[PDB]
Amino acid sequence: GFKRWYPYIDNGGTVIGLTGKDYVILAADTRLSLSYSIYTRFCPKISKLTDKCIIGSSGMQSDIKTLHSLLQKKIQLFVLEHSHYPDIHVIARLLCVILYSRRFFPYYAFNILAGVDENNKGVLYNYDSVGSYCEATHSCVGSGSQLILPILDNRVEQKNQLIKNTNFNLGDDINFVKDAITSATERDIYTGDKTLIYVIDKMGINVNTLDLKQD
Amino acid sequence: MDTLIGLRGNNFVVLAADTYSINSIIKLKNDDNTKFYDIHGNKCLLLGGSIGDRLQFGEFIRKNVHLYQYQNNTDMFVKSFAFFTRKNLAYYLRRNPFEVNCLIAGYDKKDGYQLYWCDYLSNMDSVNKGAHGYGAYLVSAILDKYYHENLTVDEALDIFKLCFEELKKRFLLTQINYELRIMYDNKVETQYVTV
Amino acid sequence: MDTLIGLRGNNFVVLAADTYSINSIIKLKNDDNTKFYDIHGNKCLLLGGSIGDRLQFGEFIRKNVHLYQYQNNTDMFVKSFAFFTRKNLAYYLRRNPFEVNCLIAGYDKKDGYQLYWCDYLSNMDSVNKGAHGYGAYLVSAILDKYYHENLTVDEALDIFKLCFEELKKRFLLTQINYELRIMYDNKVETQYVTV
Amino acid sequence: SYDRAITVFSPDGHLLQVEHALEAVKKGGCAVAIKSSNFAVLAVEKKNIPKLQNPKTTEKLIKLDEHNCLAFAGLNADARVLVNKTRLECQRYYLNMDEPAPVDYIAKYVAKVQQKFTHRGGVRPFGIATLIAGFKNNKEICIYQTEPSGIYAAWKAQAIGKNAKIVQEFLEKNYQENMEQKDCIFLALKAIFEVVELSSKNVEVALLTEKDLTFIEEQEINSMVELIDQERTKNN
Amino acid sequence: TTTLAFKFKDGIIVAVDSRASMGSFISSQNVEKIIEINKNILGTMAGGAADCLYWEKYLGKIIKIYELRNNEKISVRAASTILSNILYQYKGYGLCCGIILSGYDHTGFNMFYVDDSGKKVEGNLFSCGSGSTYAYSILDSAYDYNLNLDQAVELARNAIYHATFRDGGSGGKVRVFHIHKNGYDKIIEGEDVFDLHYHYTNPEQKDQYVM
Amino acid sequence: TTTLAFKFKDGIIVAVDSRASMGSFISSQNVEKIIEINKNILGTMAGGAADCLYWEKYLGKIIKIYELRNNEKISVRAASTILSNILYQYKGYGLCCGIILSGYDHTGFNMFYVDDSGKKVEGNLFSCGSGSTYAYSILDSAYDYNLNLDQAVELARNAIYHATFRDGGSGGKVRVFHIHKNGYDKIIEGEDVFDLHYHYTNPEQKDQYVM
Amino acid sequence: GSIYNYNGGCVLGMSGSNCVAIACDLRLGANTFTTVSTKFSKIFKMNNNVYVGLSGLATDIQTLYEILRYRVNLYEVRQDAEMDVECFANMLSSILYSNRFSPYFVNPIVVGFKLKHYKVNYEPYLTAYDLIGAKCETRDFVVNGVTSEQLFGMCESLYVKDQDENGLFETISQCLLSALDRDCISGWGAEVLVLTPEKIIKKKLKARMD
Amino acid sequence: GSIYNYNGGCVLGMSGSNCVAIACDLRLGANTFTTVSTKFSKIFKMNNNVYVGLSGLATDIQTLYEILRYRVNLYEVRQDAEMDVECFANMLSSILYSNRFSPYFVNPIVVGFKLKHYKVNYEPYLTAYDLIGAKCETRDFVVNGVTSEQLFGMCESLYVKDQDENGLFETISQCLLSALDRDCISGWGAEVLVLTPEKIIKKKLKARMD
């Protein structure tokens, strides 16, 4: 006979977020993999939702694309119906309900919402596949998350250090994001090729790239 | 497990249950109140099984019977109530079953004191005495041995006390807190017993 | 399930268990004696699990340790006894396992009062306090909260009484009969407690 | 399934079907409800052929649930269907909230049903007005009156049905607050007999308390009717 | 099956039913569920018929050899230990054995419950089989160590009767043996429970009894 | 997860930890497990994070609509019934929800436990989550209805601490809210259990504590 | 089959000369070995000439009996006559088959008189069913229930053609009792109904109660 | 897989200049979420130049440690010398593989000094194993246990070549603590051993206890 087809596949990759006082960094590698082969070395995981809000996801690429496009559609409809752009918090709740609407046949997507609210606070929300979400100062989804989250805990919170550091700034935070993603690339077979680093601050959204290892 | 016991005589019917609410390996309550469903008009539904199913099925039955009695401005007969209960349980048996065991008791002028024994499969029969749960294995013979027609209410309560002592002594779950519903002489009384 | 509790202080060790022998849904006995295995030379093995496995493993350990002590005309050290027990359990784990949980206690001049906690997989560590069974979930926090070094024997017994009351009140199996082994001052005493 | 819009706006801006339902209500018998500190009295005209019709069958003063009762005027069959819907909703509320339905909730539900029947294709409005006596969640006693259009209000005392204006005006100048049960009953009898023939068999009276709904005995009504006849003859 | 035994002031009462089943079909109503292990020890059979019969006769052989070799009577505790060890050696093989060993020895009257899982429990009152919860409830309700022989026998009979009344697996005849210092007596060789029902529950015999 | 609540003479104490887990990996230590249902009702979250969050927000919406429509405050009993019915409708679908609803209403202080299987249990003292047995044992050992606010808060904190100490699924911060007649107060917004251990169990901080 | 062992029970039909008999055990089992009732009749009167014996799952017994009573009452009020036993038998077959794929776990028999109006002649009528409505019309006897094999043996050995009412009663009662004595999950009383065109005799047998 | 979650735990090895460090958590889990002990060390001294860290199933940890102690003691008494760390590492691989098909559920690391006798030079030596004895010789760090991914991230990010004893201690302790703070089934204390040719420094860290 024929076995029942499984509707899920992990296409790999990592998304990393880090808030500041007035900025948020969201970075993601661009590899797209299938089992132990590479579909393509350039498949961006971050989509722009608003001038002040982006979304980055890891998991099944078809699900991520559909969910990003659905969220963009819903947000444009919201703008037309209500005359204003939704804040990051509104989008966070909307994404929660969208994910939970499939509670019993979930999207295979782990999503980080990054943006700056009206008060110019850097904001991060990170999600599970069924809609659970929480606000955080740094987060990471995808194959490399269990490698990266300890590093950012150590650097940002410093809970286990008596002599602490309190000099945080955008350049150092970006350097930390780059080191975290490179260290993850060192050990996670599904993270590599190239990373896009998005920075949101007062002016708006800015994009830069960093090369990762190819093996 | 929820131990249920029922005994009907010429002049009374008595129902009794343990008062435990159980959630995993812990007792949520030692004074559970989700088992007895007093129904207007000298009727009482006693339920065992999962708490959620108990609450759903019992409140559904109670509300429907109250609705019937308000719409027809009369008291439902005990037998009609028992067979309505059984039929609803049997309707849900093959669709989304309520895993609940029932003892149905009441008095009405037509049939006197009535006791119905119904299991989670909606197998029902009228009985003089009955029990549900694992503790039924440890009280049924006592009910058989000490029951007789013309038993008085006090004698029946002494029989129930024998049952409770046996459950405390020999049952793996040491049940020591019980609640009783006594129907006799056109009044329904509630008692709590610790052994 | 068989609830086992152990507490060691600077000057004592105390073990305690429920006294129930269970055969399916009925209590064979309310004064079980197949849990404690007193071993010559201020040592005690306390076991939980199936009665058959308990009897087999416990009597095997006791006989082998007595054999060792007769052959070498000396008392086995408590630590040696604990690791011999663990190693035998681990030998049988991958061949024909004894599904038993152990608390090992004793006194000797080399190490004072010792308590070892061992599970049915033969995972063992020395502890100041420990418990086995589902009632462990309900007594472990009490043990943590009320334990301190320099505790006296009477204080430790009061802690055990707290544990027994919690088991009676909140545990799904209402355990109310207990037996305790108290080791202190070069003597082993037995007590029975009802809550 | 029939879907024609039966209730529509006339050029004047009226729902003529609703006004015709109001006419039907005005062709009904009179019902009076008076409120007190923690009890209400409800009375209703009785029409029954002597010695042939059975009085115990026809029920214009009915019990919705544990704590709420209803009187109505207008079309009997419409009233029966609406009352059964209301009892069903009472029990549904109890099931979904684990508390009996308060009086205000039930009045709002009844008015919602009537409004809905003015605003759905293929149905005509109920030709009934109702008086609903019951207890709020703060245990306060209240009386609500609904109408075919779906509008409701709470009243200290109100009459519905035929000749309701005479009864209303009478109640305005004779109603006090916190009256005793006997005096409230007497006031209700006077109000009903302001527009109906004086007799014990021409009125049914009930009293609503926290405990239950209790109908006043025949002999008590006859004694109060003799009192009313005496006061009338002495006033003339 | 329902077997039971209890100590009282004159010794040990042992009572059993006599039904044997193959599935829901009654294979016999005259099987013998009390087996003399030796002059002073009786065994009861519950569970698998072949297992109980074989291993209790095997225990009888072992005890005969022991008592020849050592010129003394074995104790009930030793007999129960031998049986429990033998049965534990077959753990996982699927033996079905519920056995009560009762007897008199130099330590007095003794009673042990031994099952196929290796369980060995000393006690003063046991019951095994499908009907054992009913026998337990009756006995516990009416058990006194100071009963005389007649009262003890009557209680055993009544307990067996109620078990057979409620349990479809138990029935046939009730046998009540009495173990004393100088062996055992068969007080009731076998009495059909048919008469017991119309003696205890429905003596009138004028209509069907209603549970 | 460990959540708990209990009545005392000044109202209701509600305490929770703040850990969220994905398998054995700690997803967060700052999640908020006490959800304001309305001005007078608090909900605790145990089990599935999405399920608890979604259905308690849905209950909040339902209650807002109810209190607009009827110009009165819903009771804790009614809120719990609504939630239990909604959850029972999803029986067999695999929802994981353990919820304690606490609040003040015209019937006084009320507390209900509602789980995904439809269970709805009124009570005066509850605990849910992996660590709930430890919190239960501590509370039952030291619970008195006549405790003052300070004693009640201290007891809640200690119970949460012991749960997080013994349960790998519980940890992070302890939050202790107080529900009273005019709403609720956050007595302890969030206190790392790290300090709590070296305050209760090992204040010396001179060697590793030995369980 | 285990479902049928949950409750137990059996039914037996037999015909003599101008008489027919239907008998059943009285036990209500639970969990295959616990007796919870001893007055649970499996015999139901549809009309004076039509009886049905329903063995199997007690919930399905009660449900099917209620359905059959509903159908017979509607048919007879509409027609203003008593339903013929053959029409009822065919109707029962159709009702059982209508649940062909989620059937009622019942083992019915139908016993009664086929009336042939010339006076009126009363011909005994017997039919046994399976749970999906297959029918076995017979003249001597019908059996159903978990005790079917024992009843078949007893009937094949003991049935005697053209017995009078007393002989019929003795024979059917002996067949039922002997069969029940070999079943662990059936018995605890027996009711025997002997039908004649003039009277119905209802008897309860002094049977085994173990 | 879940067997390794039964107890939890992890071990970490790191080298500096003329120094090497081995660290472990102190928890003994049961049923994956119940902490039964907080002094269960995974670090074992074979000889002054050879330590082994054993994470995994506690019964297998103790059993394997006893086997290794037996083998090392026999080897060293026969030879009258301390076992070289590489010989010990190969021996551990062979012992684990000898159980290739019913293995010990252990995740060992070996940390110590390789002595190059000219005067004597002390070269740090680190090796990580799987449960069937596959070996990973390294110069910077080794990890094993259910916390392996977090330790790998922390080490890849924070390890610094050629640190002195104090720098080595701070680095390995920070790596271990950060990794443990993200694990539900590991932690409850940390022991850190910093090795030099002259002395061993044993430290217990003030770590999280939840």
Ligand SMILES: O=C(NC1CCCC1)[C@@H]1CCCCOc2cccc(c2)C[C@H](N2CCCC2=O)C(=O)N[C@@H](CCN2CCOCC2)C(=O)N1
């Ligand atoms: O009173 C009824 N109708 C009122 C309710 C709405 C308006 C009218 C009818 C009564 C008709 C009697 C005819 O005999 C049967 C005909 C066909 C089937 C069955 C019996 C067996 C079937 N059984 C038995 C147990 C499991 C099961 O499925 C069953 O009783 N079906 C119930 C429907 C039950 N609920 C369905 C949803 O609506 C509310 C009632 C049913 O047919 N009732």
Ligand SMILES: O=C(NC1CCCC1)[C@@H]1CCCCOc2cccc(c2)C[C@H](N2CCCC2=O)C(=O)N[C@@H](CCN2CCOCC2)C(=O)N1
């Ligand atoms: O003392 C012993 N021999 C005496 C007994 C007879 C005469 C001498 C030796 C000690 C030798 C020590 C060398 O290190 C090992 C070498 C190989 C294997 C293992 C350890 C691990 C193995 N383990 C660990 C737990 C599960 C398991 O299989 C295990 O310990 N094997 C036991 C044999 C145990 N049985 C032997 C007879 O007695 C009953 C028990 C074993 O080798 N003992």
Ligand SMILES: O=C(NC1CCCC1)[C@@H]1CCCCOc2cccc(c2)C[C@H](N2CCCC2=O)C(=O)N[C@@H](CCN2CCOCC2)C(=O)N1
């Ligand atoms: O009544 C019984 N116990 C009482 C009677 C004496 C002591 C107490 C048991 C009750 C169930 C026992 C379950 O454990 C088993 C263990 C091993 C095997 C089998 C069952 C299956 C075996 N089967 C099933 C069909 C073919 C076959 O061989 C089978 O059930 N055997 C019958 C023996 C009945 N009679 C045989 C000859 O006459 C004396 C008794 C049997 O063991 N019944």
Ligand SMILES: O=C(NC1CCCC1)[C@@H]1CCCCOc2cccc(c2)C[C@H](N2CCCC2=O)C(=O)N[C@@H](CCN2CCOCC2)C(=O)N1
């Ligand atoms: O801690 C938790 N409960 C406490 C924290 C708040 C309330 C109390 C639970 C603990 C286990 C819950 C088990 O029931 C489930 C119900 C539905 C789904 C899933 C599990 C699987 C889902 N999985 C597994 C991997 C991929 C995925 O989606 C998953 O475990 N989700 C995490 C959410 C953790 N965070 C997500 C974002 O940030 C806030 C919380 C989650 O529910 N944990």
